[model samples]
Target chain A: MKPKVFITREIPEVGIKMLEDEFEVEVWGDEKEIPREILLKKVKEVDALVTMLSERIDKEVFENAPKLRIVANYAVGYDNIDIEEATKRGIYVTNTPDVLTDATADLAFALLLATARHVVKGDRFVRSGEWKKRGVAWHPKWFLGYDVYGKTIGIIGLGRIGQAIAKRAKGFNMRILYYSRTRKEEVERELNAEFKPLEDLLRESDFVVLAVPLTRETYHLINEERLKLMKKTAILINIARGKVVDTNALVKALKEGWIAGAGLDVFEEEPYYNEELFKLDNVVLTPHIGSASFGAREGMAELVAKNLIAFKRGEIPPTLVNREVIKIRKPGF
Target chain B: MKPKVFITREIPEVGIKMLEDEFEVEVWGDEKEIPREILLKKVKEVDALVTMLSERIDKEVFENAPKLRIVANYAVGYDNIDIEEATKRGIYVTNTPDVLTDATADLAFALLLATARHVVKGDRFVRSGEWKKRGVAWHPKWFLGYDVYGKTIGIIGLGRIGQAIAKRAKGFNMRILYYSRTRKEEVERELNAEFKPLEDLLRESDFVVLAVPLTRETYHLINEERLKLMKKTAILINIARGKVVDTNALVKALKEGWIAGAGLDVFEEEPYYNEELFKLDNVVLTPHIGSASFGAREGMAELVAKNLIAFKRGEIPPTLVNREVIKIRKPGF
Candidate 1:
């Protein structure tokens, strides 16, 4: 019998079909998240699980899913997963990575351009009939926005997505400055990106983009003091984990004119964002959809499926997160 | 004594200051357009006139301003001025061009990004707190915007601003297809842009950018038939003059899903855009402020100043539009 695989939620059928061809695949068919009780029940019968970021694969899940040999997350970040428990039980954990680089980077650059150009305000002004309400063909000072051409872009965390954004900035002839935990010589040589300290990047850059991971070290990385270092004309874009920035500080900075504007996809609180930010005209907010492109999401789903298929076939999964689990398992079990 | 120069309206002080250095400059104080009567009265007194688009300089104004040696327009387009009349009367006409290319192209690209990424909708979603109202952080299919990277872009005009947009598209690894009245071999070689027929370009491109000038032949360029040729997933971006498109047809197309969405900086009715488009979530509209950047406006002012100053000194103006007038009379009178 083919090993049973349970997908916690419905994703693109391209990836689901890939799993179905190799295993007995069962997918939850609702937009809402699968209930915990049902997920636990399915884990008891399944040999592998495809999980979303919202799912908490903790001690309860690991203890219940005795037959499950692998847990493949649909996102690059695995913060909700308890890796130590998975490793202790000799269960492989994998995540879909690198496939979402362009999509996330594209969103980051989109936010930068949108905020810098007042795209949201302009849209609102036209849509709300304010242009017609005033009755004019054009106004010289009506919707003046900062130009993005030949500006300085500062990227925090020069990871794959950040590098992609730098590459896009090159086309616009923008000066690129990056601040990462460690310097990347190859990136500097290739992209002509200057590695600067965080404060200098903030002070000098016209567009500040945050793309760092979420961790104790990275949490609240852009605090009030750091935001104050930014130029008053500068715009901030955050596509990384929401906790990377202090929400209150960011709100204060925008409200008090410490910074020009912000384009944010993630928030300190998931689903629930600061209500005060809604009233500000200088900020553009998005529900966290950084990797929401159909192509990217499809790619992510396929990667998750491939990881599950590889694990079931007793080969090392391509993006295995718990490498230590391999010591206790034999190949082709 | 310095030559008398009348500026019809207040522009960036950079160029006005430049004019003040060599001429007795008088800038109209009001943000609104100077009344035709006041403009005519000023023309009777001034040696040179710096005109805005709103101030039409036809035979009446040209006849009234007999002493006017030059008419330097603050914008690139001089449709408001009668070039033939200016040539017949021996009055030089100049326009501020090239300086606004980057700023305009930046807005065009910004609009494209905003439409493709749903930046405006995302802003409204977060601002209205709909995410919290709906109570979900990650939805598999919510706000799924098109991927801009590695997609195809169709530029209707291969002018300077269009080339700049193509250049930006190159950075995103997008395939470039263009439909211009003339084939630009240099652009084709440099950007690897493929010149295609208008129909083919519309059908194949993921994003169609309209950058053609507003003329009788180009007017209503994207009518219902033309719009229907575009892919259902394709986005249309208009940064040129508003009348270049058939607004009613576009509204119907958008409503009926002939095309995916539109991002417009100019409307068919100028300040009074089609009110129907304002209601659609798929479109992003802005008041026509493509070249409204501080740097670009400043540069334009300086260019206009240089034109006026040069004409005053018996040298050919840098951006002379009516060169035939030189044969009829000397620059400085």
Candidate 2:
């Protein structure tokens, strides 16, 4: 019998078919999240699992899934999975990364432009027939948006996707400032991006884009104090994981004019963004789709499939997270 | 006494203040377009008239306004004015051009990104709580947007704003195609934009941007037959004059799925776009705010002021539309 592979949710067929050629693939057909009970039961029998960012792969999951050899996450960030537990259980964890860099960065810039230019609000206004209702053909003061050219943009992280966004800012002749744990010298020279402390970057930039990975240290990174440091005219953009920002603080900041506006792709609560944000015109909210590009989605699926295929062949996965597990237990042991 | 100046609509204080310094400026304070009777009566006494894109400054107004020395339009295009009639009456016509190029081009690209990435739809989706209502955290196929990076963008008129759009596209690593009456050799080399016929551009590009000036020949350029040439997945963006496109055909195309989507800043009718377009999810609509950036609006007003100032001193305006009027009739004739 072929080893069983379970997918927590439906993905592009490219990855599913790749896994099917080597394993008995079972993909959950529902667009909704897989039930916890269903997930727990399936983990017990599957040799490999393909998971989404929404799936919680924790200690309980590792302990129950004795047959599991690999967990391939169809995203760049694997924070949903407990790496320590997987490592201890001698199971490999992997994620799709480089494939989504361009798409996510594209989304970051898209959000920035949309927020700065009032693109979404403008669309809503036109759709609502407010322009004609008001009997104004075109007023000079109507829906005036901020200019992106020659503006200062602060990036919270200087990772791959962040660097890609910086490249886009360069095209607009924007002054780029970045904050990262380690200074990227090559990026600084190539992009003319000046490295700055978090507070300073927030205080000086006209637009701030958060691209840091989600972790204990990064949780609530843009709290009320950090938001207050930003310019009153500055626009905040978050394309990274939601927990990096304090959702309540951000709502207060937007409500009290701590910042002029914001463009958010991710929220502290997935699929349950702050309902108050919906009432505010200054905020542009999008469901988390940072890597929703057709090319990027297909690429991520292929990468996830490749990792699963390599692991099934008793070889190292292409993007292994828990490499120590390989030494702890031999394949099929 | 100061030269009597009549402004057809209220503009930014930057240009209004500049005009006030040199002329007795009387601005139409109402946001609505001035009545034809009022415009005619005002022109009879004013030495110079500043007009908006919506106002009609034609032979009728010129016939009664014997004292009018110049017509300075606060926009790049002077399609609203009868330039031939103005020149016949020895009236110098000027327009604000380069001041709005950056903002207008920024909006064009903004619309393109918004349309391709489903920025507006995503906003509405989150605002409506569809994601949470459906009990889905993240679905791979949900809200899958087309990628803007490494895509092909065809520009329909390679003017200053069109070239600016191409420059922005370069940052995204997009392949550029352009169609214009005259080939822009310098732009082709600098932007790596390939020149193609209109039909070829429409057929091949993933995104098509309309930037041509409104002329007799260019009216209804994107008719039903023309729109049929585009790929079913392609998106269209219009930031140029409204009359340049056939709004009726565009509506039909969008409804029938002749094209994937469109981002429209201008329309066939001013203050009133086709109402049927409101029902479609594939289109993003904006009031005519292409040059509505605060910086750009201020710059446009300042440019209009400079033109008026130069004309007041019997010096040629920097951006004269009808220089032939100068040779035909001397200043103060």
Candidate 3:
């Protein structure tokens, strides 16, 4: 009999087609995230499972899926999955990483332009008839906000996506300052990126971008004091995990004008953001879409499917997250 | 006595400061464009006049302002001013060209991202509580839209702004295709921009950007027939004058999905836009803000003042539009 694979929700058709050719693939029918009980029920019958960032994969999930050989996540960020629990159970965990490099980086820079240029308000102004009724189409200081050209942009955690953003910053003649965990050599020579202390980066940067993996050390990384350290004219952009920045501190900072503005994709809470952020004009919000571009999402789906297919074929997944799981048990059928 | 300069409208203080340092400057004290009657009255007394794109400097104004020796337009576009009439009267016509290169190009790209990625919609979605109410923050196809990464961008004009956009396109790894009146020789070697026929550029490009100067030949250049040449998935972005595009044809194309989307800063008519565009989700509308950034606008104001200053000193304006006017007049006090 063919192996059974359970996808927590429907994804791009190309990935579903790849699995249908090899396995009995069943995807969650609804548009929303699979309910906790429904996810448990589906996992109980499948040999391999696909998940999203919204689903929690912990001890309970490991216990429910006795036949489960692998958990392939459809995103670069796999913090939703409990790696230690899956490793103990000898289950391989895989994530779709690097496939969304350009997608996520494009989003970060898009928000930067949107925030500093008053793009959202301009669109609104045009639609609301204010532009037409106001009689003045162009004025000297009408939409004057901040200038991106020749400004300083500080990137936190200059990894794949961060470096990508730094590269785009170069096109606009921006000074690139980054605070990476480890100093990246030749980046200075190549992109002219300067490595600075996190505090110093915040102090000097006019636009600060966050692009790091969500981990213990990264939680609440930009908290109350950190927000205050940023330039009063600075704009914050978060394309990484919501938890990386303290939402409460960010809202307080924006309200008090400690920092001028923000453009956020991910927020403090998943599926739920700070309501206070909605009340402010300074913050431009988007429902977490850092990796939701058509090309990027399709690539992710295919990667997730491939990871599952690899584990089924008794081969290590190409993007295996829990390499230590193999030491606990054999990864073959 | 100082040579009198009449500024049609209040502009950035830096420019006003420069004019004040050397001339007896009288600024029309209104945020809006100066009224036609007031502009005529003000110019009658001043030796030089700083004007915006909204003012009409025709024969009537020339007759009224007998003392006017220079008309320094505060924009790159001098279409609103009658350069021919100014030249006939031996008047120096000047424009603020090249000062807004980065500002306009950045806005064009910003709109491209906003249109393809659904930025304005996403912001509205979050603020309206729909994203929170819906419960699903992200899905494989949640905000599925065009991808900017590695896509082909077709620029109509390889002017300063068009070339600037190409530089940013390089960071995203986009293939640059351009159509210029005169072939840009080193552009292919430098930015790898391929020169193509306008129709060929429209057919192959995913994003078509218009940056050509608006003239009789350019009017309605992208009409119904030209719109048909584009890919059904193509996005049109216009940062040039609105009349360069036939808005009626654009509205129909967007509604029928002849082209996927549009991001427009200028409309067929100034201060008014097609109401049908407001109903469509694919189009992003912004007021004429191509050169409205803090730095760019301030630079434009300074340039306008400097041009007026140079003309007062019996020297040709630094950015003189009608150089032939020099042969007609001595151009000295």
Candidate 4:
């Protein structure tokens, strides 16, 4: 039998075609999300599975997928998958990374500028019927927003996209700060980005960008207490994950003036719980679209499909997350 | 008479004190708008005048102010003052320019970006209870706005503020096109910009910025025909005088979707006028505040005061509008 692979959804055709030539491809193309029962039924038959950010891949799915050799995720972050559980089952979990760095960083910068400059509020004011009565009255001596040029920007993660953001900051004349458990010396040397404690980074930065991955320790990291510590004029930009910042704390910070403003691409509880933040004039937000560029999405699908093909060929996939796959490798399998 | 000068409303105490040393300064400190009859009476008697954009210096006041040697308008653009009438009377009219360029440019860019990205509507969406149902669902795919980088931007006038705006476009990698009666080779080389015919610029450029003066030739220049020449995706920005772009034409364009969006910093009328542009989502309008910065306003006052002192002492004011004064070589009697 041909090696079988299951894709959570029908992705862009550029990447999906690679899998069709090498393996028996099972694609879920329904516009509605695949039900839990359907996912469980499908998981038991595939040798490899491909997933997007929305699908939750946990220990239960790992236990059910007895024939699964690899799980290929079509995103840079793999927090949605149970890596430890997959490793225990001698299954390799691979993720597409680095390709999306520039696109994601561009979105972060756009959000930061939008929030700092009252781009959204200015739009609504005209739409609210004030313009018809009053007209655009730009007195040279009023309505000044903060300048972004020559300000310090802090990036919480020193990963690829974080570094790309720092690179763009050079044009704007911004000083860069990164926070990590240990500094990456090469990045520090090239970008001249200094690693500092998270508190120091937050305190010194005019704009604080949260780019760190979500984990048990990092959940709700930007809660009320830490948010209060930020400079009253500082702006917070989160392009990482929804769970990284506490939504209630963020809204209070914005409303009560703990921080100047916030720019969020993701919220704590998605699709139903960001109304508090919506009430504030200072916050700038976009629906979570960090890697939604036409080129980036297509690249992600292609990468995942290639990984699926490699795993099916009994070859070590270039992006394998589980190094223990070496222990389970049999030459003639 | 101590050569009295009547300020239409209270300005900074620092400038008021400085003026009081040489002249008896009459100040109306009321927060409410000074009654029109009282204002006309003060205009009739005053030797010199200091007034805001809100105060209309029309033919009636010009005829009344026989002793008024100077009308030092506290703004860059003097559309409120009857410059032609002031010219015929041999009265000295000086306006503060150059000082407000960066501040005006900041507002224009802010307004432009805000309208392009739907910042105001997006902000209201959250504040108006829409964010509660949607949360952080505004991702790259859903709330996608067009990128400004690598697009043609046509500035209608190439003056001090226009140059500053050109410098700003360097960050976004915008191609610069300018339409002016006279072209500056030095500016073109320095900014790597090109001059284009008004019709071509309007039709091709992604953003058309209005920075021309409001004179007889420029009044209603961006009317129905000109607006119709613009692309359907183009954005119109007006940070110049209100009359430069016809309000009725603008309202029609916005209603009919002749262009993608507009960011207006000036209006056809002041205080209050009912126009249809207020009801649109694609238009971003701010009350005229192009030059509203605390530091810049003070700078404008100081410059105008310097011009007044020069006129009082029989020296050429630093920013004299009546170039024919050179031919007269006359001092105030």
Number of the predicted model whose DockQ against the real structure is largest: 2
Misplaced by over 4 Å in model 2 are: A330-333, B331-333
Candidate 1: segments with Cα more than 4 A from true spot: A35-38, A330-333
What is the alpha-carbon interface RMSD for each candidate? Answer: 1.6, 1.1, 1.4, 4.4
lDDT of 2 by residue, A1-333 (tens): 388888888889998887777889999888888988988888888898899999899998888888898888988898999998888888889999889898899889888988888989988888988787878888878889889988999999899888999988887879999999998687799889999999899999999999988999999999999989998889999999889999889999999998989999998777884568789998888899899989999999899889888877778888998778888886541
Across all candidates, the chain A TM-score values are 0.95, 0.97, 0.96, 0.94
Measured by TM-score, how close is model 2 to the native structure? Answer: 0.98
- The CAPRI classification for model 3 reads as medium
Give the best candidate by lDDT. Answer: 2
Judged by DockQ cut-offs, the docking class of candidate 4 is: acceptable
**Cα lDDT of model 3 by residue, B1-333, tens digit:** 378888877889999998887889888887777778877777777788888877778889999988888888888988888889889888888889888888999899899998988889988988888888888767778877788888999999988888999988987789999998987688767888999999999999999999988898899999999999999999999998898999889999999879999999898776875578898999888888888888898999889877877776777789999999998894543
lDDT for position B31 in model 3: 74
DockQ (CA atoms), all models: 0.65, 0.77, 0.72, 0.25
Q: Give one digit per residue, the lDDT tens place, for model 1 in A1-333.
A: 378888887888899888877889888887777889988887887788888877889989988888888888888888779888888887888988888888888898888887877888888887888777775655455567788889999999999888999989988889999999898788899899999988899999999999887888989999999999998899999998888989899999998889999989888776865668888888888888898888889999889988887776778999998888889674332
Tell me each candidate's TM-score.
Answer: 0.95, 0.98, 0.98, 0.80
